[PDB]
Each structure stands twice: as C-alpha cells, then as structure tokens.
Amino acid sequence: AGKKVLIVYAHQEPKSFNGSLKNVAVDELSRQGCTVTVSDLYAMNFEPRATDKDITGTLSNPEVFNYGVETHEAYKQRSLASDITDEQKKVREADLVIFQFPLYWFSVPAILKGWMDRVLCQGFAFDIPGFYDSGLLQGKLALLSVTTGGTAEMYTKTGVNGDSRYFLWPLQHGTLHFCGFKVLAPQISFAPEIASEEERKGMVAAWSQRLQTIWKEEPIPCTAHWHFGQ
Amino acid sequence: AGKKVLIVYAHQEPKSFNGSLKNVAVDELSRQGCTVTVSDLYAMNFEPRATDKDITGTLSNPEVFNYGVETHEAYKQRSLASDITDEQKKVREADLVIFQFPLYWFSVPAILKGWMDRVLCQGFAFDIPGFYDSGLLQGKLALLSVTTGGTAEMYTKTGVNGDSRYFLWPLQHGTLHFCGFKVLAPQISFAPEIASEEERKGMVAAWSQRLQTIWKEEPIPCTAHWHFGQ
Ligand SMILES: Cc1cc2nc3c(=O)[nH]c(=O)nc-3n(C[C@H](O)[C@H](O)[C@H](O)COP(=O)(O)OP(=O)(O)OC[C@H]3O[C@@H](n4cnc5c(N)ncnc54)[C@H](O)[C@@H]3O)c2cc1C
Ligand SMILES: Cc1cc2nc3c(=O)[nH]c(=O)nc-3n(C[C@H](O)[C@H](O)[C@H](O)COP(=O)(O)OP(=O)(O)OC[C@H]3O[C@@H](n4cnc5c(N)ncnc54)[C@H](O)[C@@H]3O)c2cc1C
Ligand SMILES: Cc1cc(=O)n(C)c2ccccc12
Ligand SMILES: Cc1cc(=O)n(C)c2ccccc12
Ligand SMILES: [Zn+2]
Ligand SMILES: [Zn+2]
C-alpha cells in the first residue's frame, strides 16, 4: 500500500502527554511501514503571524496590502516565504494529516492557528471556486487529536462546556472540509492532568490501538447535523 | 463617561475596511468622552506563541514545562513578560473590550489568538472558582466586530458555512464568557471586499451608529441555545 502521514504537532514540552500521543503515533505508523513526517511547530519556532514578510516579490497592490490577494498571487508566482512552501510540500505529499495539540480556548494554540492561516493559502488548499467537496486537498484525510483540561462530562450537551463536537466546527468544517479533506473522527483525550497514571497510559494505548486500523476508517459526515444535532 | 474601552485590533493594513471600522470606533467613543486604548497587534509585532519566554526569571519547574501552570504561578508572583502584563493592565482597566478582526478559518487571526492565549491567563482571567460566572472579568463587556470573505447568505443554517453563530461559540462562550465577560451581540460586517463603495459606507456607519448607543445594550445570553438552538 504505502501511505504518507504528516503530524502537525503543537506542544512546547517533549515529556508532555501531547508529546506521548505524538510519539506513539510516530511509533505505530512507523511500525506499519508508513512514511511519517512531524512538523514540531514550537521546535521550529514556526512564525504564526500573517504578514507582508510572507511574500518576497513585487506586490499586486503595494498601496493597500490584502493578505489573501497577495498570498494567492505569491503562491501562483512562487514567491511565498520558504517556511510556507516547506509545509505545503509536506501536505501535498501526505495521505493523512494528524494535528496533535492541547485545546486552547476551544481551539488550536496560536502557533498552530498560524500554520493554518499561512500554509493553507488560496491556490494551494482551496480556490474560489474550488472549496468544501471541491477543495484542492480532496482525496486527503485529516484527523484532530486534541487533549483538554475539561473532563468528558464537562463536554456534554448539558455540562458547562457544551458538547465537544460544538467546538470542532471551525476546525473540521470551516478549515479542513473547506480545503477538501475528508475528516476522520476526532481523537479527544480528556483531562489527562486530572487522570491517574493508569488512565493516562490507557488513553495513550487507546490512540495507539486506534491507529492500528486507521486506514480502514471512513470519514465523518462533516455537516452541521453531525456537529450540532437536530 | 466615565467608561474605558480597549480595542484589540488585528489587521495588517491601516487603509483596510477593518482599519476603517477601528478608526470609527475610536472617533465615536472618543467623541462620547470615553477613555480609549487600541492594541494594534500587527504594529506591535505582538508575540502569538505560548512559550517559556512568557515567564521572566526562574521557571517554577524547569524539568517539565507546563504552560498553564507556569503562567498561573508567574501571574501570582508578578513574573510574566512585560508584553503580557501591559495588555493585562489595559484589560483590567477597561469596561468594554472590542475585538476588531477579519475572520480567518472561522476564527481570529493567529496574532489575536496569541493575545487570547497569552493575556487571558489563569489567575488573571479565570480560576477555580470563576471560570464562566466567576468570569474574573465579570462586570466587563466584550464585543466581537468581525469582517468576512463569505456573504450573509453563506452564513445561514442551511448555507455552505452554517449560521454565523456556529463559529462564534469558541470565541464568545469558550473564551469571553468563560473569563466572565458579558457578551454584546457581535457586529458582523459580511463580505466588504466585493460590496459597493456605498454598501461599505453603510456598514461603517451602522457600526458608528450602533456605537452611539452601545452603553444601553444588555448582553446576549451566552448559552448553547443562543448559538445553536431555535
Ligand atoms: C492558554 C490555555 C488555554 C486553554 N484552554 C482550554 C480550553 O479551552 N478547554 C480545555 O478543556 N482546556 C484548556 N486548556 C488546558 C489544556 O487543554 C490542557 O492543559 C492540556 O490539554 C493538557 O495536555 P498536556 O500534554 O499539556 O498534559 P501534561 O501535563 O503533559 O500531561 C498530563 C499528565 O500525563 C502525563 N504523561 C505524559 N506522558 C505519559 C505517558 N506516556 N503515559 C502516562 N502518563 C503520561 C504527564 O507527565 C502529566 O503528568 C488551556 C490551557 C492553556 C494554557
Ligand atoms: C487566512 C485567511 C483565512 C480566511 N478565512 C475566512 C473564513 O473562515 N471565512 C470567511 O468568510 N472569510 C475568510 N477569509 C477572508 C477574510 O475574512 C476577508 O478577506 C477579510 O475579512 C476582508 O476584510 P478586510 O478589512 O481585510 O477588507 P478590505 O479588502 O481591506 O476592504 C474592502 C475594500 O474597502 C476599502 N475601504 C477601506 N476603508 C473603507 C471605508 N471607510 N469605507 C468604504 N470602503 C473602505 C478597502 O480599501 C477595500 O478596497 C480568510 C482570509 C484569509 C487571508
Ligand atoms: C474554556 C475552558 C474549559 C475548561 O474546561 N478548562 C479546563 C479550561 C482551562 C483553561 C482555559 C479555558 C478552559
Ligand atoms: C471557510 C471560508 C468560508 C468562506 O465563505 N470564505 C469566503 C473563505 C475564504 C478564505 C478561507 C476560508 C473561507
Ligand atoms: Zn464539514
Ligand atoms: Zn456562554
């Protein structure tokens, strides 16, 4: 078969529970014979800000800077900053992109938000038209593997946080589905800091075990119904 | 009068539609006699990454870096980096915090997500008790003023993007409510880039007119039913 996996990883501490989930992914996917690449964004000191430094050539309109217009142009001309094109090459080759991160404010850490903002540019990840089911990364799979401070019960329809699915919408639908990815079901590892060292061990092994059969999974239907019900 | 307002603004171009919305807010609140401060994040080159540089001096466990713990302890001992403390002082004094940004991936641009991640730290914005209705920032108002590339029709419940309220959840509930803010209804300026020079003038003046009576508004009820319900 032969599959390539990119893990986009956003945690500052190699000994953390996120680091353990990234490491078990690399170990199990490597064991299976997959080709594996990890973008460890804090180690890379990955630049999160969307600025005019991300285009190196003559701007389309140097008088009034529009990041979307300028990057779309720079993508077509090949004048994006090289850190963006280095990530795009990894995504272009990947069959599966796994994002591994702690939930910050019901979303990704800013450094990973900046990866989405800068790497998934128009022309590369989507065109207008050419989005959602027609997005440019059609054929690829994506998977969010998230850790939380809040417990699974806090993340239910009647807990303080509401259902976990509700915070997934901007990431699954607005970002990944928009770019054409098929979205695998999220891995959510709840409250590892509260949990006993046994329960943590179990959450790590549950992810490892799921990865054994990841290429047999079908995606979610990434719709408003799946996220919010009715 | 007397009221203080902090505008946290995330756009690269002063001549942009966002720039215009931020400047009319300054003009109108300043004309009312309010005390106004603007954090222009791009112009500040505001650091978005959550890293051990956010703690000055001596880590409270430099064997296993835990950002939430380290920053919580740093805030209690007055040892957070001065860019964060400078923003915390603006927020502590403010009665209203307005966020002005273009929607990037159904969320805030990464530089503003970095402001949320690094300024709204434990001890300052939330605690046990006091997430949500201990929002430690209770008493304060917050308002998101957002611009989009997609049209209002795209942002309906059966439109491609789903209702606008769907993507507001992590920002209004998961972040603003959580820290104790009362949330004013969002100001959403749909698709300025392709609007006429007069639709745009319409949207800027709706904003300026809204701001004339901002202090008479009651917060939205920041609940799952508001965002997703009927
Ligand atoms: C700015 C900010 C915003 C946040 N916003 C949210 C939010 O919106 N909602 C929310 O729910 N939470 C939020 N959190 C909390 C955050 O999501 C959790 O702190 C994070 O998810 C926990 O993951 P971790 O890897 O850092 O845990 P760690 O502290 O590294 O791990 C927990 C424990 O598991 C241990 N462990 C590591 N590896 C293994 C292993 N292989 N086997 C057994 N045990 C192991 C670790 O040593 C540790 O003791 C926020 C935190 C911050 C800083
Ligand atoms: C990484 C990225 C992700 C994105 N993700 C999304 C998303 O998830 N969903 C989505 O809908 N969109 C998304 N967009 C598109 C984005 O939200 C819009 O491009 C942005 O909101 C447009 O607002 P602006 O200020 O940048 O418009 P501008 O281009 O600055 O302005 C529109 C026009 O009005 C002019 N103008 C300035 N001031 C005034 C004034 N006072 N009166 C009249 N005209 C004025 C400007 O010069 C310009 O010609 C994304 C864009 C990027 C780059
Ligand atoms: C929004 C939210 C929910 C939650 O459950 N936890 C633990 C948090 C910890 C830090 C910051 C925000 C949260
Ligand atoms: C997610 C999304 C919806 C949308 O309507 N538009 C215009 C976009 C433009 C660029 C990137 C994402 C979007
Ligand atoms: Zn979807
Ligand atoms: Zn709420």
Q: What is the CATH number of the domain that holds A81?
A: 3.40.50.360
Q: Are B142 and B100 in contact (CB under 8 A)?
A: no
Q: Using H for helix, E for strand and C for coil, what is the string for chain A?
A: CCCEEEEEECCCCCCCHHHHHHHHHHHHHHHCCCEEEEEEHHHHCCCCCCCHHHECCCCCCCCCCCHHHHHHHHHHHCCECHHHHHHHHHHHHCCEEEEEEECECCECCHHHHHHHHHHCCECCCECCCCCHHHCCCCCCEEEEEEEECCCCCCCCCCCCCCCHHHHHHHHHHHHHHCCCCEECCCEEEECCCCCCHHHHHHHHHHHHHHHHCHHHCCCCCCCHHHHHCC
How was this one solved? X-ray
Residue with tokens 């910050």: A104
Most distant pair of Cα atoms in chain B: their distance: 59
B17 CA distance to ligand 2 middle (Å): 6
Q: Do A5 and A95 form a contact (C-beta atoms < 8 A)?
A: yes
What does the angle CA B146 – CA B152 – CA B157 come to, to the nearest 5 degrees?
A: 105
B103 marked as binding residue:
yes
User: B67 alpha carbon to ligand 1 midpoint, in Å?
Assistant: 9
Q: Which residues surround ligand 5, an ion (CB under 5 A)?
A: A 173, 177, 222
Which domain, by its residues, includes B135? 1-230
Token reading at A194:
């509260």
- Contact between B220 and B226 (Cβ < 8 Å): yes
Cα B42 from chain centroid? 15
Pair A28, B79: CB distance under 8 Å = no
Q: Is the CB of A145 under 6 A from ligand 3?
A: no
Judge contact between A26 and A207, C-beta under 8 A.
Answer: no
Q: Name the phi and psi angles at B9, rounded to 5.
A: -120, 130
B164-171 vs A164-171: helix axis angle to the nearest 10?
110
- Annotation-wise, does B2 bind a ligand? no
Nearest to A174 by CA among A145, A135, A123, A217: A135
- Documented resolution in Å: 1.6
CB B167 within 8 A of CB B103: yes
3-state secondary structure chain B: CCCEEEEEECCCCCCCHHHHHHHHHHHHHHHCCCEEEEEEHHHHCCCCCCCHHHECCCCCCCCCCCHHHHHHHHHHCCCECHHHHHHHHHHHHCCEEEEEEECECCECCHHHHHHHHHHCCECCCECCCCCCCCCCCCCCEEEEEEECCCCCCCCCCCCCCCCHHHHHHHHHHHHHHCCCCEECCCEEECCHHHCCHHHHHHHHHHHHHHHHCHHHCCCCCCCHHHHHCC
The domain tally of chain A equals 1
Q: In chain A, which residues have their Cβ closer than 8 Å to the Cβ of B169?
A: 106, 162, 166-167, 169
Task: Count CA within 13 A, CB hemisphere, residue A185.
Answer: 11
